[PDB]
Design a binder for this molecule. Structure first.
Ligand SMILES: O=Cc1ccccc1
Ligand SMILES: O=Cc1ccccc1
Ligand SMILES: [Cl-]
Ligand SMILES: [Cl-]
Lengths: 259, 259
């Protein structure tokens, strides 16, 4: 038996651990261990987003997960969408606990620009937010930009290739969130010694209507990865629309970082 | 075509509106309207159950749903497990808004004993709590008893016939809850003129391992229904294990109350 790995999965803003409900048993049936982190004010986390005023607070449950791992264990750390940012923040704190970072339809930040740089770049050219509701919350850390996805926007731009049941599930579980773009723009740049030292790969869906191909190529061109994997027919929510094919991708990454 | 109906679906303790993610699109594909309510401190409500101290506070979202219906609209109101108690409370308030009550693997209270009667009976009888964690919380009006299911318990007694993904999903979303036994013990009896005036039917799963088949006849003997429907092969979480058969049962019920 090839030795198996421990996958740590990190969800996107406005969602929670639940998004991995299809992928997690597939990985576990193949012998791997899986930890699906619930970030602050996400999923069933008892805080509202208004109480989570910085990206460091938002990311704390991932940092805690990594901190709690036994000596010398290393994980395959998978960041989805805004979870690319969380996993970068984590890699700058515990680089030696991460075998490889997996940027799944994710923001891939660099070590040259402020950490908000790839978000700011997408936000400028994003296309329609549809029925998404924007709001502000003033805090001792400044003003937080909040959003709550609207259902037409979800259907059209996130879930377009997902079974109707997954879309209904998401309608019942998605929450108001934030991309923390203000807090990120004033944070120290990610380090070359921490984050920059960790192996990375990028997994993209061919039909992601949120993170388009040319934008991904721009991010990778600014900050290279070791390999790129494509999931044909995937929407942005690829763990919901193509979980088997996502399994196949992760399995191929796990064989590549054997030992 | 047949006249379609508005189904209001009420989940069980420790769960939320998400449980209905397979059934809702089935009902909606057939032309019906569906509202899946989220009870207080349930699902993604960022309020802990400790803050909700009374069954009336718990049930408020359901009450609000019915109050918001336009004048003369009537619904088929479906309560699952503890949701049986919520639908009875609602029927004592708005009996004329309810075409029929559907007790789905549910507690069916009577109008003779104190409202906690059927819950107290089940707690005396039931020996399989397993790794469920029981606890108390003191309020200004007395002890409030709480529970958080354990995952071994869930698998053995609630989800044993569900796809593994549904179990994984429940593990990521279940929460500490309450059956409000003390509060319900102090409450006035349900009335004949409200709750007892409403049409009611029972839908049971043939392999319910928490609400046993005999306990169901005992409840229906204490308080009769118009009709009992049986879903063959269902576990307790029958909207997850046998959603198409549950859809069949509710479509038969809707045909029976041609509105
Ligand atoms: O990928 C996560 C996301 C969340 C809200 C809006 C757009 C994208
Ligand atoms: O059916 C709901 C339920 C909830 C918690 C424990 C046991 C049963
Ligand atoms: Cl995101
Ligand atoms: Cl229950």
């Amino acid at each position: 038996m090839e030795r198996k790995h421990h996958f740590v999965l990190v969800h996107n803003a406005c969602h929670g651990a639940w998004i991995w409900y299809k992928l997690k048993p597939l990985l576990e049936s193949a012998g791997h261990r899986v930890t699906a982190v619930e970030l602050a004010a996400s999923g069933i986390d008892p805080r509202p987003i208004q109480a989570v005023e910085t990206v460091d607070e938002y990311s704390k449950p991932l940092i805690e997960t990594l901190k709690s791992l036994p000596e010398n264990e290393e994980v395959i750390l998978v960041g989805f969408s805004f979870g690319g940012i969380n996993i970068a923040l984590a890699a700058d704190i515990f680089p030696a606990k991460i075998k490889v970072l997996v940027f799944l339809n994710a923001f891939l930040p660099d070590t040259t620009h402020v950490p908000s740089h790839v978000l700011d770049k997408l936000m400028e050219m994003f296309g329609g937010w549809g029925d998404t509701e924007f709001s502000s919350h003033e805090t001792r850390n400044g003003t937080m930009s909040l959003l709550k996805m609207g259902p037409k926007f979800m259907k059209a731009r996130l879930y377009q290739n997902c079974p109707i049941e997954d879309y209904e599930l998401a309608k019942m579980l998605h929450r108001q969130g934030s991309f923390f773009t203000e807090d990120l723009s004033k944070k120290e740049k990610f380090s070359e010694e921490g984050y920059g030292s960790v192996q990375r790969v990028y997994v993209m869906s061919s039909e992601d209507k949120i993170i388009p191909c040319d934008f991904i190529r721009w991010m990778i061109d600014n900050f290279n990865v070791s390999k790129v994997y494509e999931i044909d027919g995937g929407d942005h929510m690829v763990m919901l629309s193509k979980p088997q094919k996502l399994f196949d991708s992760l399995s191929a990454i796990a064989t590549d970082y054997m030992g």
